[PDB]
Amino acid sequence: SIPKEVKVAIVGAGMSGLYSAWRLQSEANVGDLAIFERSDRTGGRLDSDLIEFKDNRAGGSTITVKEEQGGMRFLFEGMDDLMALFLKLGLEDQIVPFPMNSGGNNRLYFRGTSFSVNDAEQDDYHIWSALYNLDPSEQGVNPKDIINVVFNRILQVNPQFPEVRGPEFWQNFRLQCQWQGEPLYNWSLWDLLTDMGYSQECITMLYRVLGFNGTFLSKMNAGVAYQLLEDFPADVEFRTFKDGFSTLPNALVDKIGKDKIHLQTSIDSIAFDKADSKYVLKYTKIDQSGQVSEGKFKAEKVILGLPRLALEKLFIASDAFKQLPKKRRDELWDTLQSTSNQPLLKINLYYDTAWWGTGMTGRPAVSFGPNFADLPTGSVYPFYALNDELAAALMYDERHATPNPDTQHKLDGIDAAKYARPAALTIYCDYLNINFWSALQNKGELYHHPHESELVESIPSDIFPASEAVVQQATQFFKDIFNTHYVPQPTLTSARIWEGNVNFNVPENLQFGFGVHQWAIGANDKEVIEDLVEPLPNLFTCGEAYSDYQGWVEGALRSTDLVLQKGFGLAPLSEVYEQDQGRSSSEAIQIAYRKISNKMIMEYIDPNFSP
């Protein structure tokens, strides 16, 4: 059942569409809105899974493993809009550490060699000079520090151009700093380092050892690439939600109501009734028996919270756009082209127990963070069965305290216990590595462990299994990476390739947009962003794909915030938060987390902890 006419139509039930709805309901009384979503699920590029494995330990019990098919981490600083969102939805009590290292034990596979992070530090970083035919100025330093030093040189040469480095910083950085008279957004990073005199060997080392080579090889420009590279310092304290990033959209859905959200309802095109001055949205819904329907309705205001690919599709097919003048239609198409599509993927393999601990490898145990490799892997992130004690031990560790032997010893048993509970690995890769897995996942039968109901009762709806080819090659690279003969067969598998599709012969449950976007070369994104708020009268665009903060949910909320500003008069949520609370969302979130971490620690770790 679909309304006649709504005050605002919301196209897209990702984070951008949901956020708009909740803010207009709550902050603007607007209750005559509805959300139209083409998939059978809400939340878009945020997609968590919770598997209740059958406890089949010697001892009808269930053990839950959280995992991510999309978004996974966030930060307390630089995401004020997202922090305020958390604080206002009362979700901060679920916030849990996302750790990024294992004390140097994380894995590294390059040029047919498997080793650890601590290994790579040996001997003035000798191994890198041995695997890569580096220039003298490029030897004897840690790879990541090369990107670091280059950043510092860029800043030294642009004095014309700050403790917390947020989207303002990153927009001005790429739009105002230059190199050899050319500003950074007219540069590719690949051309940048080369022009700076780095060897091609060094440059391949950089994009292989950073796991995500699109920053170098894609058409994305150097300035936005840097924004991404300097988002993962050594001392990052990422956090996540215990039950997954889907906590946030689900929490938004409860507070919107499933009755204003219309699933399996793709908005096909939009015209504008010149008479009663209302947009007219042609759509296609599948009902619950699976029998299609094609309708149409009006709306005074239209909100498209859609990425680059979806927006071109509507633009092509909509009378509201075609009947625009040649110059403005072509100008507006042209500025759609100014953000580059970044494919991403994540393939999760669950195991009844974890085999990368010292008990199973005979090598120093791997715990948390990315295991990088120049194999199609890109990077590999371990995920563990949910467990309160473990998060407390992780919370103790975010504090760089000095445990006394009693507490150190208990942290040991905790660090080792997790290997006995179920767990999973994610292969998270980008640009260059995608095609390898593409062809793999679409060829041959799909993988299923035998007796797949004897462990795992419900299997979530959003889980498409990895192809048997994908598991096969993933199992061989894992042996390579973790330097062990022993990698068993997954209990469960999921594959998800965030790469937009233009083929009609693809089911809905397999159609997914481009995982991330990043500003293209030559793209003045100050003009692009502002021209895409209200490009037609009362028709708005918002979302991550053309934000200040590409690749992150904060990007979606800031881009939506401009829509809620220009079309509805709401100021930025972070500014709203401060006025109502007398302090920032950054400050409020830290104080709140400190208390829960403080508790969790005295409860499980050191009952005598003092901050």
Add this chain to the structure above:
Amino acid sequence: SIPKEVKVAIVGAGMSGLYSAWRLQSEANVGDLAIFERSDRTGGRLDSDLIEFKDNRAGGSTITVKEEQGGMRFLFEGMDDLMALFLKLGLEDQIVPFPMNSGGNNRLYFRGTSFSVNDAEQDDYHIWSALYNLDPSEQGVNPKDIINVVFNRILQVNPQFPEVRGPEFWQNFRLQCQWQGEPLYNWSLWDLLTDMGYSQECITMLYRVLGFNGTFLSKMNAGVAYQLLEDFPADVEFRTFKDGFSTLPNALVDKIGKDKIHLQTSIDSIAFDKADSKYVLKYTKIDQSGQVSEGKFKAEKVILGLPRLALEKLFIASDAFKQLPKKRRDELWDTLQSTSNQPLLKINLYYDTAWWGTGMTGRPAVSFGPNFADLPTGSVYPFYALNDELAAALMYDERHATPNPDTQHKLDGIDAAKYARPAALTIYCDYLNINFWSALQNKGELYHHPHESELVESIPSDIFPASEAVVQQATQFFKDIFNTHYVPQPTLTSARIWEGNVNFNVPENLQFGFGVHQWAIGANDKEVIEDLVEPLPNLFTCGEAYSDYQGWVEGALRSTDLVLQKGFGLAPLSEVYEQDQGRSSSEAIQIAYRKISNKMIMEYIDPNFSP
């Protein structure tokens, strides 16, 4: 001035549109046809340049250098349609060797190491085991032979599945041979070698050392990739035209008439007048003062000789297509998607003299063929000022004769003389290397040698100069590749990036389609090809992009030949040739070339030559 109405409208003045016109005029009396071309030049992806440098040797004389901005080589076997075309246009007297090696002196740059082909043979191919962390089964053999052996294994395991290996062979190969129960066109080559057990090191070696990595990393499927890899054996005797591949389209234009060809006339869209049963083609022409015009005309039969990208553009914007039923419109869009777009580029740098001969390097001289590298270069091909004696010496060399010292000694002076005349290098790269040059060519001022009229009188219309950034980095890689401190500044430069564009803010003289295409994964190209001959009634498609022989002009002529068959009753030109001549075009072209080579040799090389 543009006709009311023609019997056949030809959209595209590349090789496919020109060939259709000439065959319908000549073989079918149809003279009420006209060609509509969006650019200011005929010929499409065939684009030769001829520069008359000012002879400024000590001694108003001009020295001409042929070069290629697109297509450059062909073969006497497997291109029967193209050979018959040559023989019927009387162009065989201009056919000249295109050599592919320099006796082992060609260059190789990999992992920061410059060396020669003869070097790589040393010591059971030792250098490859030293640059690449190869598996034991992958050491001690020449890289190219790995692709060779893998081919032979594929054939061994498919006995169900031939002296001259033409398009029939290659279609059946990829559509009927399988590996692990999956036919080759359901495979990527990357996944294929991996599943066969090759190391990732080995696989990076293969796609770097073959210069054109799209065969591995693009979405093209394994079978078509092989067709391309086994098109360059060791013993290839490529030939070209002395004045360039543009000889062929120009020769077609003379025999069509510039009066039936309409340049700067883009066909914008096509509808179908249901009344007088005629297609109706909306267009846009620029006149000779540069003032636009938008007209329209009819045609009984429409011939689109256009690649994948151009065909989608019309499909989107044409009432003849939109008003098709949902299922057939979406089916036909879907099968447009079944050939993968392969970007290509070629950047030519001309020099008053050649600096890679032993006189300028102190190293064994480089002569002909690809100098490969894992640098963004991809490959580098030397081009020399035209010179009759040189082609005779090259013709002597296609015969693997054994010169007596007199003749050997004269071939020496000839081999060395060319370094003193002007010459040029082409950087010919693909897939992964494109973006590097992209950003380079679009940033900063464009390169011009000072006093650029004091040598080079006319500069051809199709020459866009390389950006000053492109020359800068090209000059540094050349020093790397040719292992010399000394690489001077080009006298003239051209850049041309065969990568389709969707931006309106691009001039016409910079809009170029995708350089080549290759069959995607999952694409049964027997069905795709035949469904795209006459997809609407009396509206036809032909060209390279969906041919049996992607990447070559023979592909365009065979795909057009199906259009001339189904819509007009003409049999294949090669079959036509045989009936009229009593023998093949392969046989006739070899006998003709043998005679001219036989002459040329006795004239310049060994006046006592016996075949």
